[PDB]
Design a protein around this ligand. Sequence first.
Ligand SMILES: *[C@@H]1O[C@H](CO)[C@@H](O[C@@H]2O[C@H](CO)[C@@H](O)[C@H](O)[C@H]2NC(C)=O)[C@H](O)[C@H]1NC(C)=O
Ligand SMILES: *[C@@H]1O[C@H](CO)[C@@H](O[C@@H]2O[C@H](CO)[C@@H](O)[C@H](O)[C@H]2NC(C)=O)[C@H](O)[C@H]1NC(C)=O
Ligand SMILES: *[C@@H]1O[C@H](CO)[C@@H](O[C@@H]2O[C@H](CO)[C@@H](O)[C@H](O)[C@H]2NC(C)=O)[C@H](O)[C@H]1NC(C)=O
Ligand SMILES: *[C@@H]1O[C@H](CO)[C@@H](O[C@@H]2O[C@H](CO)[C@@H](O)[C@H](O)[C@H]2NC(C)=O)[C@H](O)[C@H]1NC(C)=O
Ligand SMILES: [Zn+2]
Ligand SMILES: [Zn+2]
Lengths: 76, 76, 887, 887
Amino acid sequence: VNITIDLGMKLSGYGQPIASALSNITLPVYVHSTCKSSLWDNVFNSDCTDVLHATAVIFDVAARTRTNEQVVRSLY
Amino acid sequence: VNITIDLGMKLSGYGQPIASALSNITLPVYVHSTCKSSLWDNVFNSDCTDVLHATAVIFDVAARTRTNEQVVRSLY
Amino acid sequence: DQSKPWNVYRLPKTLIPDSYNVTLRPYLTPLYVFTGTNIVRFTCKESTNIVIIHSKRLNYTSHQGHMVALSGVHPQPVIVRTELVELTEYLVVHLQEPLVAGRQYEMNSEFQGELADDLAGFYRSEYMENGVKKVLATTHMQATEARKSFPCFDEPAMKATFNITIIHPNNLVALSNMLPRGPSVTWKVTEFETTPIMSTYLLAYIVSEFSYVETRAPSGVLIRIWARPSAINQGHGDYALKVTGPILDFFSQHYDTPYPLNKSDQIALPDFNAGAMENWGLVTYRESALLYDRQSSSSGNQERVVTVIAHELAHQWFGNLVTLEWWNDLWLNEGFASYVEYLGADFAEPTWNLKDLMVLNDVYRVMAVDALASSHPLSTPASEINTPAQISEVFDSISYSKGASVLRMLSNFLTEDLFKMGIASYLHTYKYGNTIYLNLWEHLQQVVDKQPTIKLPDTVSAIMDRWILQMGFPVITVDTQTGTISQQHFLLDPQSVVTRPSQFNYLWIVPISSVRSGSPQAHYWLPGVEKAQNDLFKTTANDWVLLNLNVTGYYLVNYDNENWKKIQTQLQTDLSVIPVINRAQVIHDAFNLASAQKVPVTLALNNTLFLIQETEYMPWQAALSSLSYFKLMFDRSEVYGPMKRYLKKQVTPLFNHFERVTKNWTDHPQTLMDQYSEINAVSTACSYGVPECEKLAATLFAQWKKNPQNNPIHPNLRSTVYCNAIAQGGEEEWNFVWEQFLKAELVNEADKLRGALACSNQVWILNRFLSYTLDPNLIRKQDVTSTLSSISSNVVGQTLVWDFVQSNWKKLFQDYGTGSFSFSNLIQAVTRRFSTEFELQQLEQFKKNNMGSATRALEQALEKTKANLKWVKENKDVVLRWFTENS
Amino acid sequence: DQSKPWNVYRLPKTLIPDSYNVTLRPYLTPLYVFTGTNIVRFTCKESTNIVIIHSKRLNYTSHQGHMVALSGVHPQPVIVRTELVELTEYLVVHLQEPLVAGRQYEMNSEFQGELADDLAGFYRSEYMENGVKKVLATTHMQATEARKSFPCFDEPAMKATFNITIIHPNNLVALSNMLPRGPSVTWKVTEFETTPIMSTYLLAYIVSEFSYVETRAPSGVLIRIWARPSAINQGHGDYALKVTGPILDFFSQHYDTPYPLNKSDQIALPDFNAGAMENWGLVTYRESALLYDRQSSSSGNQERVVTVIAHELAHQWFGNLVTLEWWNDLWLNEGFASYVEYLGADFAEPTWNLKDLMVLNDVYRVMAVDALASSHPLSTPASEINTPAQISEVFDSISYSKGASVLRMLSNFLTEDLFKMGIASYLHTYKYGNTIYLNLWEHLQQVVDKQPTIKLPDTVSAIMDRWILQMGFPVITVDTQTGTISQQHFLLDPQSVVTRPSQFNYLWIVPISSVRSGSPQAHYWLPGVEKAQNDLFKTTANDWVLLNLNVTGYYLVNYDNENWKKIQTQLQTDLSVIPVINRAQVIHDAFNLASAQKVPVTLALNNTLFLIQETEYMPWQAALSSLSYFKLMFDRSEVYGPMKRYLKKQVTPLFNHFERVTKNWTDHPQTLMDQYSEINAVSTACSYGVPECEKLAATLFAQWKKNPQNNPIHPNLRSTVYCNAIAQGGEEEWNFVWEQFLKAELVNEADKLRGALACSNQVWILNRFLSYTLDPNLIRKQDVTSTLSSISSNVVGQTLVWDFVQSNWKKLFQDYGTGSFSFSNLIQAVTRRFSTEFELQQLEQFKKNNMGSATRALEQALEKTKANLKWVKENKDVVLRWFTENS
Ligand SMILES: *[C@@H]1O[C@H](CO)[C@@H](O[C@@H]2O[C@H](CO)[C@@H](O)[C@H](O)[C@H]2NC(C)=O)[C@H](O)[C@H]1NC(C)=O
Ligand SMILES: *[C@@H]1O[C@H](CO)[C@@H](O[C@@H]2O[C@H](CO)[C@@H](O)[C@H](O)[C@H]2NC(C)=O)[C@H](O)[C@H]1NC(C)=O
Ligand SMILES: *[C@@H]1O[C@H](CO)[C@@H](O[C@@H]2O[C@H](CO)[C@@H](O)[C@H](O)[C@H]2NC(C)=O)[C@H](O)[C@H]1NC(C)=O
Ligand SMILES: *[C@@H]1O[C@H](CO)[C@@H](O[C@@H]2O[C@H](CO)[C@@H](O)[C@H](O)[C@H]2NC(C)=O)[C@H](O)[C@H]1NC(C)=O
Ligand SMILES: [Zn+2]
Ligand SMILES: [Zn+2]
């Protein structure tokens, strides 16, 4: 149904977008992706910028960035 | 007629192909381009490599490289 | 004149106190001073016509013509005279008639002292809060400083109850050992409940304006953490409160004795040079070691917090409930705490594997100073400590670290259960009393004799005599061709002469475990003879042995070359067979034996070849600690070329490993050991020119500089990133870091920035930094020497710092050589690269042109320079050949 | 005892030689020696009974009992005795009867000398060809060294014809001043034609195995270039042969006299420390200054070749055709050549604008040493030069550079046509004779008096007396508010005391040109008075003046502040109005006046603000030469921060300009000035951290390292690229450059690589280089000091080099202080950064602990250090403020 994925994105030490494993999935078949950025303290209180922008895709739920796709969680 | 252009190519101090103004044109309308490379001493005794490869194009006769075209001479 | 009893440093055994009534009234308004009144109730065990009581810098008020008044509890004594003896810090009262034995007497007095800025007795601490300056009144009365606050029998064996009363302004709050008796009613009076039977040096009371966070354990103990209101509001005291409870529960179960008191207050002070004091019921810390900030603190700070809390809470049973009879047994107290803190911490942090760090923190730290001919035994007769300076002399690193090591060894060869049973019996038998180490040995022997499982070659006291009565530790040499085993007194200097006699002729009774190709063997005892033979140490061409498992014994181990080669082959084949502690042990022992010219240095270098596949922290830490001397001796010569290369070759995989583990440095490990390993990997990779580490540091520094408000760099990596970015960059990075340092409010971040500022490769920048160090507005005085040492660590800054010190000798000596040991440490730190004859001649010329303690420091530097010159001349060619062949 | 004529250093005026017959037979087979026979024909002007003739280290053979034989051309003299006076280098023959006046006599002798390794007289030179060692026999008989080869009247005023004969192996060839008389017939005899009337010090003959390239001018002169056969085959002598002809034609037209001889041979020697010698018909050069390689030589080498050829070919008329009467007028000869070489070179290279470089090469080079109280005048009486050491003392930089400057000024204010006419008359009148400068002054005065156009304030000799009889030069101060003009003796030290008296009281008669806002004015003469007034120097609020046009006068110029501001505004508005030589002059004069505390240093710094839009070479060169002292004094302090920034801001456009002109560094300029400007731009941009220059250097070094066989880097940029790549990189670049240096066959490339090896920023690499300098197999002895100086130029290597020199003082003094001035230059080069009291105290302590010329060098270094300390303490704050405000 209306499945929502809250992705968490971080900027790596080399300056690359990395999809955090702390992303959340809600199952209360449209998919709604909400992106949140954070720092080393793992506090997702900032909206994602252009660089750290990913779309939730789908089994394994992954985050498609502008250059790659990274597996976040598994909906088993 | 059978116009031949002997282009002279050099590698710049930044590592870029530069078309030397010492290129030669012969008029004894097919165009035949022959590429020769050299060093700071201006001795075109080496065949052009892949990087320093240019094709003579056409008025002004120029040298089209893989990334740009540089005017070599003028056939006025 | 020892005939007069008031000329003897030891208090007479004629009068025994029972209870005290102390009333104090600090005057925080300035010439800061305090006034008070005191009542002492004592019993005369033997008839005497004189009363002697400790007193130090107290002005008394005349009472019927005399300083103090005396009465019975009635043949009232007549005070013929009363005087002060400043040499022995005494107050002598002469009575016209001898006191009747078996009768109790009360002495009243009224006195006025000073609240000075020296951390002794009842003093004052001035700090800066916001833009204002605030003053608090606190006590540090350890050892022989309770006499400075009120007249008392200031000896640990003199135990009495105390009734404390404080008079303080309404705007302040007062803390003591016990709970207040009720509400405090421009001045208020606070009274506290009667303390149990305790010693004078364990008392404390503090008047200040502080906030607290409180909790209650299921056992009913009220735990409070006190700090400045800002720190409490920011939540900097939450971790200490969280970990205090589990540690108290662990110590209650381990000692098999409930917590003796009802409350547990721990207070953090902005300025406390002592570090921590184990006052009964009111523990005092420095705020840099008790408060934890989850936004700017690294893992080392958290480990320090938990370990210091465990160490100070261990004293509540062992040290306060049962106290030492005299200051010559202090090693037994402190060392015990220094051993059990890890255990307590291991209970609070089960996943940190803290008990493995103790070796690196203690054993290897003390073996450096215990392997010298200038060492001293743990135990000395009580008659050799009478002067307060002699009393203060026993608080040294030997008493802590080596005491912890020997107690750990004793606990290991007696098993934990028997050790705990003996400790519990000892605590139960002598509660609210004083003891000597012989009583503990007797209790342990009683526990041992009641079980048939464990058998010892001799009694507990006989075994411990070898380890507490003579200095040093043995080296045990094993020949596996025949299985012969021998022991010898180990010294770092092969040409050293020991002039301190020993009653055992430097022979120990040694407990020895071992494995055979990873399979445990039977426990063995070296019986105190020079040589012996056994088949536990005889091997064929296939198997090998390794003795000191987990380094539970306080000795070094040496093998024959074939056994070393087999061990190296096993390390190159499968690391997991050999425990990680022993993997660090082989490196440490090989380097120490090479320094003593017992094995070639090439063997020590061969022992480091397995680090290319090692991901643990302790072997890397041991190897880097050993190779620091090589780096100091060879960083300005041709040997530095290959050596760096070799280290790079060794460190490239480890870094790569973490680069894969951390997901390009986004997620960081949660365990302490893995975090230490990651810090080591990043630091070593950036120090020896790995391009990925430099790129990481540059990118992180750029991210930080883009948004200085929020630091994107994890606190574990900040120092390495800052130093590497400054080293790679130029004036812009240095200026940015300097501007950040100037506006820094915290202490850890400011220290990290100041340390990073010394990594510059430009001569003019370093000279400008040296010029900055002369201004107190930019660099604080208490940091100046540290800064210099950091600038001395740079290979470019060695000559600059030496010239700066030579040019400013008088000012530096005046500012840091009056009563502090920081000047000697600065002199030692700036001369440790000297290994050439030209440098030796220059140092000798400087000494000749500069003729107190400065000359002694120069002489020690000259001796160290001569030793370094000899070592370099002896080892340069072979180490260069090895590094070229193995890089 | 001056009564005896053989104790007088000056030869008697009694005997005059007419012709010589010299026969020589070198023995290249080794104890190398040579033998010969000699015949001297002379006339006795006055009757005498003694014969004195120069002779130095010649073993004679007995002829009838005496060393030499004498006969008439017959009252045969009887030789009573013959002896050698070693002090005056004489051979004295005593005759029983006085010689008859008006009669000619012949003296025969047979002698045997040594072919030593010292470059004096007839000596030997040993060089390495391929893998073998070869020996040649050559002569350097300048000054007073022809007596060392054969007995002669060795004075320049003694002129005679010569007949030379050589006996040499068949495998060798022999060269002399004249053409051989015919074919040379295991030994061969070569005879040469009779020389014209010439002096003894101009003779030369060389026996060697050399090849030559020949050509014939349209005038009929055969021009030959001689060198080693390998160099001739490779074509390294083509440029010299090409340029020799045009220079000879120019000198034939300029002197208005044809070439006196028939052939012109120029020979390059592998080892010739003298540089070049102007032997008549056979000029000798060092191969590093005569041979040009079109594959590895830069533009500086080509300019040096053409200028040295012109300088040596100028002597064929002025110096050889007409010679000095005595060694006290040498400044007239050398200086003249030092002025005309550029002119000759300007004819050979019309597009190089060489005549503008002379200032930078000569005037500004000599004003540094002529502005000291220790200077000396150009002209001295002949009676003050008698000792050969005194004769050698006159060959100093003053005689060359200041002589060239004064002769250039004289030529400019007399116009070129009149100067050439006077020179031609002087050459025609005194051909094959000797002169003094008064004769040249008289000829110039005669030419001046024969024309009405040019008018002088006095005679030529009266004007030149002010410039040749007193030391120093004036500074001319102009006040434009009133038009007043004054002159003063200029000294660099404001607190210097001049103790050398002057007959003119240090007042000159000064020729002054000027422009008014770019418009020429009328020529003016300062008449030898301290102060004067004229309306040529009075300006309104709009116009400005500038005096020394093209710096044709040997003096400094100072203005009032308003005129300086107007000049600076004009420079910021339009550069083209002011000539480029004067654009360099303003900077040079401002800095020199600031050093003398006549103008504030801020004015000198303001004068450099126009360089941000300057694309010429001379102003940049002058500014960098002036700022080298600032860089030396401030490269280890806080002033180095802003200063570099400012220089970067000034150099960024110029670099960009050439980046656009050269088409990303592919096509390089063809004119000498543009090439110098490009070299300056690249060097300055890379030295002060311009990222584009660093990227260019890294890319070029990578291209070179990819294919070491062919060097893709243009020879003009090789030094900068190598040094910058080594500075940016690490051990790999340094090792590559070191390996290239070890296998280098040429000299210029090896020198460039060795200089680049000293740009490393690593302490251990620099220490390893210092260790390498101790091995003669790696670094040659003759380069060692130079290498040290280069390592001293690095700010990191200053302390390392100073410590190395202090540690190896004795060996360095033994190897380079025995008879060479290289040790003094090394001492001066390694101590020029000393500006602090600590460094001064250390230097004084070293001097006290090290007590010949070494102590004098240390004392001079102490004085320089004191001056530097005072200057830094006086200027640091203001220069820091200026650099911060203008960066
Ligand atoms: C300190 O205060 C305590 C009570 O807090 C006093 O102990 C009491 O003393 C009185 C008077 O001697 C006895 O009657 C009580 O039995 C004591 N209470 C007990 C034992 O619980 C103590 O004496 C005071 N100390 C002094 C006065 O020196
Ligand atoms: C350190 O290891 C090296 C390399 O294995 C050892 O040198 C070898 O020694 C064996 C004999 O045990 C020789 O057969 C090899 O040829 C040696 N290899 C070399 C020199 O490259 C060296 O002995 C070890 N050092 C010790 C044990 O001190
Ligand atoms: C040097 O050789 C020259 C010839 O090359 C000699 O000059 C000739 O000398 C003879 C003998 O006196 C005269 O008869 C000739 O007239 C001279 N030739 C001329 C003037 O052209 C010269 O005498 C020789 N020098 C000596 C012998 O000292
Ligand atoms: C160098 O140039 C500066 C900048 O122009 C001069 O300082 C100025 O002086 C004028 C007066 O002539 C003042 O009106 C300006 O305010 C000054 N500007 C500043 C200080 O920024 C300076 O005098 C010059 N130095 C000299 C001539 O020695
Ligand atoms: Zn403790
Ligand atoms: Zn000359």
